[PDB]
Amino acid sequence: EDWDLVQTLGEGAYGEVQLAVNRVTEEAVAVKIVDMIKKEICINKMLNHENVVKFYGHRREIQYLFLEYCSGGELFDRIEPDIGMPEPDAQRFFHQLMAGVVYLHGIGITHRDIKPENLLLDERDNLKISDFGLATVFRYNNRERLLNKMCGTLPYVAPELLKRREFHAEPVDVWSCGIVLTAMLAGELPWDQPSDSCQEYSDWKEKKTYLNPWKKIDSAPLALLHKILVENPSARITIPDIKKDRWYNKPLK
Numbered sequence: 724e725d726w727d728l729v730q731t732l733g734e735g736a737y738g739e740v741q742l743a744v745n746r747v748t749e750e751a752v753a754v755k756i757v758d759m760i761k762k763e764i765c766i767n768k769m770l771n772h773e774n775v776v777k778f779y780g781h782r783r784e785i786q787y788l789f790l791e792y793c794s795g796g797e798l799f800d801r802i803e804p805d806i807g808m809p810e811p812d813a814q815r816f817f818h819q820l821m822a823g824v825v826y827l828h829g830i831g832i833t834h835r836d837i838k839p840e841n842l843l844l845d846e847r848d849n850l851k852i853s854d855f856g857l858a859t860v861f862r863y864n865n866r867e868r869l870l871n872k873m874c875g876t877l878p879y880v881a882p883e884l885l886k887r888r889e890f891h892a893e894p895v896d897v898w899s900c901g902i903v904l905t906a907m908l909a910g911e912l913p914w915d916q917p918s919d920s921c922q923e924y925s926d927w928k929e930k931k932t933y934l935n936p937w938k939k940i941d942s943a944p945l946a947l948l949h950k951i952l953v954e955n956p957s958a959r960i961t962i963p964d965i966k967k968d969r970w971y972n973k974p975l976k
């Protein structure tokens with residue numbers, strides 16, 4: 724019942740996250756502090772999956788969210804700049820990311836800001852999707868609603884979000900998962916944003932894969948990236964088809 728605030732884990736816009744330890748059980752949890760979030764709590768209440776940060780509850784005093792503590796830090800910190808990480812680790816992380824994203828989409832939730840900073844690791848390096856502050860419902864009563872608000876993080880957002888007034892939620896999270904995979908395999912982000920004024924993005928659309936970061940990436944995972952980082956959201960590979968991808972299914976290590 725009584726928790727000691729041991730240390731700060733991370734900072735956010737509207738607050739900070741602190742590690743809290745139970746005085747009796749010594750259980751660790753993370754506490755997200757927000758000095759007024761209503762939708763974040765609501766969405767968190769729906770979530771129950773092994774690749775999504777668990778929600779234990781909240782107390783209003785300033786709002787306090789009680790969330791799963793992930794001692795392994797963030798995926799961001801397993802990526803060596805300009806190098807990435809070993810391909811078998813990247814594949815395992817990507818499998819776990821798809822599992823989390825499939826779950827969310829299955830309950831009609833889109834995260835909207837998938838990036839390595841938001842993908843946390845537990846003590847066994849299991850990936851956990853965190854931070855549902857930008858998340859929203861895109862399906863309800865089996866009826867899809869198109870999105871129109873721009874949010875997320877420029878290097879990770881899909882090009883339709885910049886160009887179209889309305890867009891489907893799922894292909895946007897698929898795209899950001901592809902940017903995450905690129906980062907894991909090349910240790911660099913391919914562009915500032917996916918717009919026609921961005922030279923690196925133009926190069927990609929013209930298939931200059933002899934340039935970085937694409938030249939650091941083996942042809943198998945690169946063929947999967949060619950299917951994810953497709954400009955037309957309607958032509959973009961879906962998750963069920965990602966699960967059928969050759970590299971996705973390649974035994975590694």
Ligand SMILES: NC[C@@H]1CN(c2ncnc3[nH]c4cnccc4c23)CCO1
Pocket residue numbers: 732733734740753755776790791792793794796797840841843853854
């Ligand atoms: N960018 C990550 C860092 C450290 N971080 C975390 N660190 C450890 N465990 C956590 N569990 C969480 C549940 N929800 C949100 C965040 C965490 C969290 C907080 C954010 O800044």
